[PDB]
């Protein structure tokens, strides 16, 4: 029980990836399904949900979808990205990636 | 199955726009300034969240930032799109708009 600091942000991470034309569809199944098992292991994650262009599912330059990971420490997010288990997958995805943009989003609304 | 209960929502819309080259800073703040005012004007608007691309050094396509507006649903989005206030600003932004992609992101957790 390391416990560690409690809460921090929370910080929101916005990531978008587009599967190029060549990767099998079934692979995407295990990729998403595998992600569920990945989080089941990756202690540092808390929760991980996905989000695809919901609306017309077309109007887009080629986003495909985005993946957000809930964290309680910007530092922990570092350990996550510095994970071999995750890297193993990201490495496989790289073998067939069309585009990927990693960006961090923080909840900072303006007072009205 | 499924009953009339609040869950899954609301829906989080993600938008990424880039400012063409030759855009002044005073304009950036102006646009962001107006938005805050527009948010106050736009009656239909759960909440307005804004964020900055964390780590622009590298790993980016040129998003710079992303606009995310909270809506009750897809129906509410129609109201936003059917807004003259937003249109007025859109026309102004068009004066210096590079790219604009609309994407919807919803937190969909999977049972582990």
UniProtKB/Swiss-Prot annotation, chains A, B:
GO molecular function, one term: metal ion binding
Gene Ontology annotations for the cellular component aspect, listed alphabetically: cytosol; plasma membrane
Induction: By salicylic acid (SA) and jasmonic acid (JA).
Binding site for Mg(2+): 39, 42-43, 45
Cofactor(s) annotated in UniProt: Mg(2+)
One family name in Pfam for this protein: Dabb
Alphabetical keyword list: Magnesium, Metal-binding, Plant defense
Highest taxon of source: Eukaryota
Annotated ranges, domain Stress-response A/B barrel: 11-105
Coiled coil, from the record: none
A GO BP entry: defense response to fungus
PROSITE patterns attached to this UniProt entry: S_R_A_B_BARREL
Annotated InterPro entries: Dabb (IPR013097), Dimeric_a/b-barrel (IPR011008), HS1/DABB1-like (IPR044662)
Assembly notes: Homodimer.
Function: Heat stable protein involved in defense against fungal pathogens. Possesses antifungal activity against diverse pathogenic fungi. Possesses antimicrobial activity. Possesses ribonuclease activity.
Record's protein name: Stress-response A/B barrel domain-containing protein HS1
Gene, per the UniProt record: HS1
